[PDB]
């Protein structure tokens, strides 16, 4: 996260970090005790991945961390149908052992297609992660977060020569300076509805970070809500 600030412990209890061949390489959010939702481009290959919930400072011990293994990975079925577009950039991770829910480990809410879109159109969401704090810079030790405004589709489109699909939205500031960045992918874009946060996006891609005239590109979760609820059912 560029131009954000330190979260407080438990401020984003749905946030998780992904560790693997690279440490702290992407984020994710808790769907329920057994399932994480993240970005598909974080979890290509069948490489072993670990999840840490209740994480705050990745170099220290807070005694709130819960580490789990990923036993199953379901990228969206249409991800990488078209090469290098990052359309459908969303994936689900099944944990080997259920998370124990507490003040530091809490699911994010997921509304239906209609209300997810309504909440997105509130025009203001929070994004968080342990990604780069400067472009081609250092990764964060303490969890960062940033409020980012929604950008209208027409402006979004003209901001980049790459394709923006209806499964994506733009968010960021017209003057730049504040943005998600490398390492933040899979992290939740959440909208707070009277004290209750709902998942409205996933950090996906961009062109550099925090540059003026450019915006962060996010997976539009409203389009995948039915898919998420179908795949993550607890029995």
């Amino acid at each position: 996260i560029v131009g954000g600030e330190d979260a407080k412990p438990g401020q984003f209890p749905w946030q998780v970090v992904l560790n693997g061949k690279v440490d702290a390489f992407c984020g994710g959010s808790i769907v329920n005790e057994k399932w994480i939702v993240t970005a598909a481009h974080c979890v290509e290959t069948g490489v072993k991945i670990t999840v840490v919930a209740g994480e705050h400072n990745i170099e220290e011990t807070e005694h709130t961390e819960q580490k789990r293994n990923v036993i199953r990975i379901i990228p969206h079925h249409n991800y990488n149908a078209a090469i290098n577009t990052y359309n459908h950039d969303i994936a689900l991770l099944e944990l080997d052992e259920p998370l124990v829910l507490n003040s530091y480990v809490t699911p994010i809410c997921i509304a239906d297609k209609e209300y997810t879109n309504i909440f997105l159109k509130f025009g203001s969401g929070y994004v968080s992660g342990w990604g780069r704090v400067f472009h081609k810079g250092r990764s964060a030790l303490v969890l960062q977060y940033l409020r980012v405004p929604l950008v209208d589709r027409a402006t979004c489109l003209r901001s980049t020569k790459f394709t923006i699909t209806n499964n994506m939205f733009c968010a960021g500031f017209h003057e730049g300076g504040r943005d998600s960045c490398q390492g933040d992918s899979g992290g939740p874009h959440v909208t707070e509805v009277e004290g209750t946060s709902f998942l409205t996006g996933i950090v996906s891609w961009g062109e550099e970070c925090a540059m003026k005239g450019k915006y962060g590109i996010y997976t539009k979760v409203s389009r995948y809500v039915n898919w998420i609820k179908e795949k993550t059912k607890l029995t």
């Binding site: 530091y104 809490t106 997921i110 509304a111 239906d112 209750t196």
Partner: protein, 51 residues
Amino acid sequence: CNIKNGRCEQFCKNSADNKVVCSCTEGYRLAENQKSCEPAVPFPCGRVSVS
């Protein structure tokens, strides 16, 4: 549901009579005022409880 979500805290749907039926997401219960949403579990989704 036209104005302010039919004063529903979370979800709203049009019944009839120009009336409103409110509802909440999983982990929450419809409060007896038939508008607000109350936690029905120890750690409901989307809430900060670290205090």
